RNA sequence: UUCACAUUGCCCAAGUCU
RNA sequence: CAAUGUGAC
C-alpha cells in the first residue's frame, strides 16, 4: 500500500494537437551544492525577519565566513551554498545585530544535482525531494525579500496603475512559482495571479474609504457607535506604522481629546511630548500592542503598513470589481505569462546565477491528443444517439433512456403571490409538462396540491401534510423568491426528516421560462425520481466494463478562510449499475481541515452493499477517483484510504479482493495549456478543445499521470484536470484509463455536456455541499449532533437527492 | 434555488516577533 | 456550494 505504479506506457489514442504549457525548462548544473542548518535565537520571529537577519549576516561576516558569495535561505533553518564554506562540520556561533540575534551554522550534507539528473534520466527510480527542495529555495530566495510571498506565489503593487476595490482594498498582481521534475528537464512552473491587499495609506483615508466619506471633516463630530464599530471591524488585527510597527487590537470608544491612561489624555500626551496639536481630536484612537496595556495612537499619525493581504471575504461589489480586473481569455493569459517571464528575467537573478541555473524564457512545447467523445444513447421509441462536438451535445428530439412517469406531484410556492401569481404558476406548469413530455418524463396531469406559504416555519407542517395526505407522491416542486433561509429548511425536511423528493426553482425562472432552463430542470427531476437520463453507448465503452466494476468518487470540503471549528466534510458516491449512470452517496462530518477520509472503510462498505443489492454483482474491480489531494499528501492519503477500501472488502467477505485503481483528480493546480496554433483555439475564450490529453513531456518522470481537459472552455482559461494513479491492481494501459476517465465525464446527469472532472467526483462535491447546507448555523457530543444533521432519511439513502 | 465554464473561498503550501 | 462574471435556446 505505498509505491505508485510506473507509467505503463504512453497513450496513442486521438488526433494530435500542438500545445504550449506554462512550464519553463531549467538547465541545472551537474554539480554538488552544500546544505547548512541554521537556528536563530529568538525563533518566534516571522519568516521574513529571519531572512533579514541572515541577509545582514552574509554581508556583515563577508570575510571570515561567506567569502564564497551568495548563499540562499528558506526563512527558517536551511541555507544553501554553491561552493562550500570554511566551516567544517564544526558549528559556528555568530552574533548579528538587526536595526540582537545569535545564529549558529551547522553543516548537514551535500546535495548532488548530478543525482537529480539521473532520477530524471531513468538511472534512479525515485526523485530526491530534498534536491527539489533545494532548487526551490534557490528560485525563491530573491523574490521572497523583493516581493510579498503568499503560498507558492509572489505579489506586488503594480507600477503605474491602481486597482482600488474600495473599503481600503486594492488588487495586487503576482505570480505562482514552483519547481517540478518532468519526463524532460526540471520545469519552472509560472502562472500570473491577483489578490486583494490593503492600501498603504494614512489611517485617516482608510477611515474615509470604509465609512464612505468623500473626506474627513465630514463631519467634525465624533463617530456614531455604528460608524465606530464598522471601522473597528475593518482595522482590528491590521498592522500600522508611525519606524514603529504595531498590530491594531482595538478602537477606543472615546476621542483622543478625552481618552486617558495612567502616566494623562491622548491629545495632550502628544501635545506635550511630541509638539502635536491633533487636527482631528474628535476621532477615536487605535489600541495597539498588548491588549492588557494602554498603548493608544491617534489615527492621524498612522498608516496602514504596505503588503498586507486582505484575508476577509470581499464584498459583492469588490468581488465584481475584482473579476473585471483579472478576467482573461486563454490567449491573453498566455501572453501575460509570457510577458511576465521576459520581464522577470530569472537568469539575471544573482542567486540563480550563483547556482549556474539557466531558465528558458519561452513556454514548453508539448504535443497533446484530442480524444474522441463517446456517443450517448438515449431511449424512448427512437433510442436516439447523440454525438458530442466540442464537448457539448443536446437532447432535442431525444427521450430519456429510462424516463419517469410523474402521476402525483405537488407545488409549494414560497414566493409572494403578488409577485409569483397563479397565472405564472399555471404557465410554468404548462411549459414544464410540454418539455417533460418531449423529454420522455411525462408529467401526466396537474399537481395534486398547489398552495402559497411564507417562512421557514410553514415548511415542515406542509410537507408532513403532503406526505400523509397524498399516496404515491413523487415530487414537491418548490418555488423560492430568491435567496432565502427557506431553501435550507426545505432540504432539511425533504432530505433528512421526511425523505421526500424536492425540486426548488427560483421565482424568476417561473415567471419567465425558456426551453433550455426547463429542459435542464427535467434532467434533475428525472434523476431525483430514479430515472436514467442517458447512457454511454454500451459497445463504445472500454473493456473494463466486461466485468462488474464499481466507480467511486470521493471528496473532502473544508471550512472557509478564517474558520476555526467547522467540521470538514467527506463524501463518497458509488455507481449502482453497469452503464454507469445511477449513483448512491455517503457522507460524514469529520475533523476540522483533515483531508484524509476518516470513516472511509464504512462508507465504501455501504456503497458495496448497495451495489450488490442493485446489480446482484460483486465488483471485480474498484475505481476510486479521489478529488483534491495535493502531491505533498499522496502518501499519507493513500496509505489510509487504500487500506480502508481493502478493509471494507475484507470485512464483507471471504478474500473478496477486487482490484483497486486509486486516482487523484486535481482540478486546482498551476498547469495551463494553450493552443500553439491560433486556428485550434475554440470560441471567444480561445481554449484548447474538449478531450485534449497530455501524458508526455511535462508529466511525471516515472509515474502514471496525465492531464485531461475534458470540457469546453466557455470563459477565461480552462483548468486542465490532472490525474495521478497512486495505485492500480488492474494494470490499465494509458489509453484505456484516459478514455475511461474521459468517458466518465460524459455521464454527468445535470447537463448534456462533458464536464471538467468525472461524474463520480463531481457528485461527491454535490454531496459535500448539500451536507454543508444541512449544517447551516448548526456548526464527541458535538460530533454526534453534527453527524446527525448530515444524515439523510432512510428513504433518501438510495437516491440522487444531491442532483 | 435550471445548468456548465471561470475567479476567489479548501488538504499541502502560506501565515504568527501609551 | 456562496459571492461575481461568461455563456447555453
Ligand atoms: Mg475537496
Ligand atoms: Mg500546514
Ligand atoms: Mg453562481
Author numbering: 22 to 120, 127 to 269, 276 to 296, 306 to 821, 836 to 859
What's the paper's own text on this?
In this study we provide evidence that human Ago2 contains a t1-nucleotide binding pocket that specifically recognizes adenine nucleobases through water-mediated contacts.
We first visualized how Ago2 engages non-A t1 nucleotides by determining crystal structures of Ago2 bound to short target RNAs with cytosine (C), uracil (U), or guanine (G) in the t1 position. The overall conformation of Ago2 is nearly identical in the four different t1 structures, indicating that identity of the t1 nucleotide does not affect the structure of the protein. Inspection of target RNA omit maps, in which the target RNAs were excluded from refinement, revealed little or no well-defined electron density for all of the non-A nucleotides, indicating that the non-A t1 nucleotides were mostly disordered.
